[PDB]
Design a protein around this nucleic acid. Sequence first.
DNA 1: CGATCCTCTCGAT
RNA 2: GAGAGG
Lengths: 65, 137, 147, 230, 228, 49, 119, 56, 56
Amino acid sequence: MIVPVRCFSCGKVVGDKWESYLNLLQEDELDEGTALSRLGLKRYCCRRMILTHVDLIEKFLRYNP
Amino acid sequence: DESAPITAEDSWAVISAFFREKGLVSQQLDSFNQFVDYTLQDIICEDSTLIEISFGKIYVTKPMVNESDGVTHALYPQEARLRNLTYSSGLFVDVKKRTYEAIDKVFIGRLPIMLRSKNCYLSEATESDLYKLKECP
Amino acid sequence: LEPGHAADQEQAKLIRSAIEHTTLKSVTIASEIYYDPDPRSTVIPEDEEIIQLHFSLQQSPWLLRLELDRAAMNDKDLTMGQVGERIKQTFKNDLFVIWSEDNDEKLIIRCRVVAEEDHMLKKIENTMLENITLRGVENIERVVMMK
Amino acid sequence: SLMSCISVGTDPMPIITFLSEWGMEPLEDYVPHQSPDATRVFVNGVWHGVHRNPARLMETLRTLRRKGDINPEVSMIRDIREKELKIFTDAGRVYRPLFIVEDDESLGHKELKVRKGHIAKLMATEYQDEYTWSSLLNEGLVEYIDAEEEESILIAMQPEDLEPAEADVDPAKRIRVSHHATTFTHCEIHPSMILGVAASIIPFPDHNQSPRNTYQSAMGKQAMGVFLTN
Amino acid sequence: KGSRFISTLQVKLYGREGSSARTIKATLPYIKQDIPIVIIFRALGIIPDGEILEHICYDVNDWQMLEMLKPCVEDGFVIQDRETALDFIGKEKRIQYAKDILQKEFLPHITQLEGFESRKAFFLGYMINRLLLCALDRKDQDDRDHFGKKRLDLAGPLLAQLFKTLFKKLTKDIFRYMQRTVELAINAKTITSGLKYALATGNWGEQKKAMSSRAGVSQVLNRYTYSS
Amino acid sequence: NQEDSMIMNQSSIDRGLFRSLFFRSYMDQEKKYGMSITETFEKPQRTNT
Amino acid sequence: TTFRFCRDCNNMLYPREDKENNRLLFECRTCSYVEEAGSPLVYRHELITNIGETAGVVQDIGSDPTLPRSDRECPKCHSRENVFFQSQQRRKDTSMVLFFVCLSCSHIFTSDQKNKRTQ
Amino acid sequence: LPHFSKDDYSPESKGFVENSYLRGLTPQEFFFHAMGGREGLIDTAVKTAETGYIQR
Amino acid sequence: DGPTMREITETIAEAKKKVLDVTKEAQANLLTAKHGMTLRESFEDNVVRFLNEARD
DNA sequence: CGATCCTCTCGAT
RNA sequence: GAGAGG
Ligand SMILES: [Zn+2]
Ligand SMILES: [Zn+2]
Ligand SMILES: [Zn+2]
């Protein structure tokens, strides 16, 4: 269920980084740790935000209504 | 080599094979499917016959709804859950009206169906069909 | 123990055997019924030496023969003479008891009844094992020495 | 537990017929003093007859269950010392799968029947999401065991770490005893399978005082998430 | 399969450890007293002591066990044939009643049919053997906590109980309707609501509740998290 | 945070940490029986009520 | 004890003394059969029992995968292939003693240093 | 356990946890600890309803 | 410490040998039971002490 | 005739 | 009645 805007712990904006992260993983065929670092997600509080996120919205958008 | 012994990591391939085949609720499904496929016919053929009304083959329809001032149609679990209906199939048996002569088909009722069992719509449903039926894959 | 006298490890062992309930069942390996018709001539070759004695300082051809455990007899403060004289002071005249010495390799007690005899002996053996107090106090099953 | 199943029920009648056909004196014709070393044969608590060479009968019975000729959920227990063969086809028996261990090249000298080749086929089928769980079962590489049969078998806990050979250590690593028994018939698929749904969520429960794992098992059911996508 | 008559047979060893003359008596359904084992064997057609003891003791050199059974042989001495053995149990009409119990009530698994006696006598002897093995301190008391000896009943077996019950009621309702036709009307609602009631409530005993079948079979299904 | 209490960060709560939706369904039907007697779903006023 | 049956009846033979010749005879009470006793031992109790210690020693014993295997040498053949167990006598006051079965002989040997044995 | 041979009175065989919670417990050790653990929860559950009745 | 662990490891192996020696002794019929208790009870009591000693 | 306390929620008659 | 909380 959709990328949180901002890291809970520090407040760093993370909601603009999801699509770029998926691309870094798929298109550039990079590993999660270097993908996170390329996004400028240096601290572990910001890293858990994205790496740990589960995008259920995709599943939800599948329901026909 | 193909004949080389398996290591400890290799156990998860086997564990994935199991589950990919069984899932996590196999006991539930296996028991019910056995009841429908074998047990049901056996109960019907026990003391059955009378003084002469015999009971032949039993049939289990897919789950349907008998609508008050309406026709009978396919009942899917999401419609059952929302409309407070019982997701059940109709039981129909072959009844012979044998009449003595020298010595000397029929609706039985509705059997509640276990979700994701053989008689349940969802058992053969694809991922796209589940979302279409408002059911979680 | 007695106020003296309570440091005496020996006096404790003595009071233990004096109070711990000991029956015949607790000392016996096996009991047997043989047909030894001649009272002064054994059919059992082991017993020969016992019959040589027990004549100085009528019966039954049926022998009730008990074998006792050397270790159990030593765990309890028992001697054959004690076990024997205790069997003797039960049936008194209606049973005849002979026994092997305390040094004598295998511990044996030989009994005889002083028509319809065969059953009576099997009945006596029951009373012998189950209903005879060798030493000790009734209800006191196990006694342990503790410092 | 994660991999345990319950027996559904099978008609015992074909087994009974097979037993009378593959040896087995009927009870009516049994005379003990002239068959002193005979195994008593029980099918669902019913003593049907006796058998002289239960070793051959037992080899036949197991081979068939491994081919699928006898239903994999049927349990056959041989008590060598008690001179008894017990077979159960009835429902309600909680069973679990185990890898089969067998002699290879030299009579000694056991090896799991599953080899890397089988694992490759399993994973080929995984990537196309051909070789399924039923393939392992029908080829007799894996097999179902209930508590009654568990009594007659010797299970290794790990494939490698329980059966390669003997001829330094990590101080950090936990202490593991050894082979100390090498007459294995079976091997655990994976010991973590002794656990059920809730406890399977706990990280490192092997590093926790046991009641804490029981406590977590309760609370995991009180934790909100996304119960269903719909 | 086919009904579910649960008769429990008890083979009891009378006399305490240390009490001479320890007898073995068995319990039969619908039979007042306990029958001394030798009398059961004779009622089954196994007459000679040697044959009766062969059916119990499976090794000739086990004098220990044969000495255990000597008081039984003595307890049965007065009965020396099948007719009198059946007679002892439970006129004439009583002999039949006794024969009937042995086929119908005694060991209903095995078989409930006529000619099987040898099967039942061997099994009866297997139970005595098992009893003596423990009584002789060669075997441990049976562990009533062993999972192998326990069966877990699921949806299938549970519905099969109800569907048997409800289908017999339907069968009974039809016979009554047929009886009234002294000069098509099948109550479908019977099954439909019967099955619904049991699954709707915990009550797994057909609107009665009297039996602890109510226990909590069928619960409203946990949906807090996916794991629950 | 003693005897099993805990200190949670308000700022991270403001950003959504451990925030949850809660749903509750309320049910009703028009009667159980009555050939002519039927309950009605409506906004009730006076009518002696 | 070791008991006999009527050659014809298959019923237990009950004892009977001669008295005149002082001899033990076994008589059948279903008919007129009478044989002499082979031994005077008419009864045996046994409270400290050795019987059933070694029980379950079947030729197929070695094929039991659950039975442990020692490094012991069989005193008879000198085979180091054996299976072992503690007393099968399921009694509280039983000895911790081990019984080995040579998987090549069928020979039963014990770990016991005190007692001998005759089996 | 069916991973042991018959008549095995060794520490590991009868429930001796050699390892520490830090090192981690083996499956055999894990099961045996769970067995010991359960006896505690069972009597906790009893030594509450029983003591409550005493107290009354 | 690495050294403490080594010492702990050896503390347990010596306890493991005490239990073996006592076992081997029990199996040889050399172990005599004290008045009031079984040979097997005596053994179990010894094994548990060695094992508790080791943990302590 | 006994079989902890108190607290909650749910469904069904 | 069941499920739960300390
Ligand atoms: Zn951050
Ligand atoms: Zn005769
Ligand atoms: Zn040898």
